[PDB]
Amino acid sequence: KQAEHVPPYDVVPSMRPVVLVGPSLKGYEVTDMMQKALFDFLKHRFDGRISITRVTADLSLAKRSVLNNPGKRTIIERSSARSSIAEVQSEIERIFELAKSLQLVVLDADTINHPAQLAKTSLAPIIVFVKVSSPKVLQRLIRSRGKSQMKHLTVQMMAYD
Amino acid sequence: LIIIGSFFVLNLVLGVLSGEFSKEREKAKARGDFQKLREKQQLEEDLK
């Protein structure tokens, strides 16, 4: 049973990180607006105990066992040398070292849109849900923004769906 | 004459009309009129 051999114990950081998802896909007007006011409250209330960081790199392809040494050398010139995996692993320790310093960590990347994909990584973070109840609410929330929104107005519904 | 033909008759009319209006109000449940007002009530406070 060494093809997978899933270990009973898994590596986790010192404290569970908190990330923000919902009520729609990240990067959109409202979704970036809802987190803007929410993250602002945490730093004032938890002054001296929190550290909010922003990472612009992808996180979807992050499994606990995929290779002995993923992308150790960038001069390999292979299918993974030119990819972002050369810097994907670097930020994992950055979250790891952030928890080591005994403080609250906040992850608000643009690459998280569902708790399912991050439910199997090494981080195992805290997922906060800001559900807006009926989908009809979201509509008039985005309709009042401006012409920057109806260029992709419809995908917000399936973003919540 | 005033007590019987005016106060008692007015009581009769009020009772009959109240019963009819209650019957129509109960009938309106099948159409679900109250549901439309209820959802719109809890939707406006969401936007506010």
Side-chain angles (χ1 to χ4, degrees):
Chain A
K1 301 198 175 203
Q2 271 213 1
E4 277 169 340
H5 211 148
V6 184
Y9 285 75
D10 42 346
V11 57
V12 294
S14 168
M15 66 154 256
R16 287 171 47 73
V18 289
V19 317
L20 194 143
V21 78
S24 181
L25 283 196
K26 274 278 186 82
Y28 287 127
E29 258 185 272
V30 176
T31 304
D32 258 347
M33 282 295 217
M34 312 279 268
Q35 54 91 38
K36 260 184 67 178
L38 256 186
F39 286 144
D40 210 39
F41 174 79
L42 329 182
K43 56 156 78 56
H44 276 200
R45 186 48 71 80
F46 289 134
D47 202 343
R49 312 165 155 207
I50 202 177
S51 193
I52 294 100
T53 60
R54 165 87 161 85
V55 287
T56 59
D58 192 9
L59 205 62
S60 71
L61 269 298
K63 314 310 140 181
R64 271 168 34 83
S65 67
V66 279
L67 207 57
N68 280 110
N69 215 350
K72 177 56 82 189
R73 307 274 173 249
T74 58
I75 61 171
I76 293 173
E77 192 63 30
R78 259 179 55 245
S79 301
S80 186
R82 204 179 161 92
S83 53
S84 170
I85 321 297
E87 58 96 9
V88 164
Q89 188 60 259
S90 83
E91 61 208 277
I92 311 303
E93 202 72 28
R94 297 220 75 235
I95 311 156
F96 285 180
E97 61 76 10
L98 214 54
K100 195 176 188 294
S101 58
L102 202 163
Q103 36 170 20
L104 300 165
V105 317
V106 152
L107 330 180
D108 46 42
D110 208 7
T111 180
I112 293 97
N113 282 296
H114 206 286
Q117 56 260 9
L118 268 79
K120 61 197 184 304
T121 79
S122 160
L123 292 161
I126 294 178
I127 307 297
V128 300
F129 196 19
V130 285
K131 185 187 93 204
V132 294
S133 301
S134 165
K136 180 51 212 75
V137 190
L138 174 137
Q139 196 20 75
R140 258 186 274 284
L141 267 186
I142 60 175
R143 187 248 179 175
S144 74
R145 298 315 304 123
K147 200 167 181 177
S148 80
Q149 200 62 286
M150 325 76 75
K151 71 198 193 279
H152 36 63
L153 202 83
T154 181
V155 277
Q156 310 300 307
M157 305 310 203
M158 320 99 75
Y160 163 100
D161 208 319
Chain B
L1 164 72
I2 288 296
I3 286 171
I4 287 182
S6 166
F7 281 155
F8 186 51
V9 162
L10 179 73
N11 194 1
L12 258 59
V13 178
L14 283 181
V16 167
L17 287 183
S18 300
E20 176 98 8
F21 289 158
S22 163
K23 271 197 287 197
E24 302 290 319
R25 169 92 191 121
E26 198 166 334
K27 268 191 205 64
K29 289 320 178 58
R31 304 201 341 303
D33 178 346
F34 184 62
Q35 328 303 321
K36 277 281 268 207
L37 181 62
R38 182 51 192 194
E39 54 168 289
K40 189 171 189 309
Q41 270 300 100
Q42 83 187 53
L43 193 139
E44 191 86 70
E45 56 194 24
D46 292 6
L47 269 206
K48 152 174 161 263

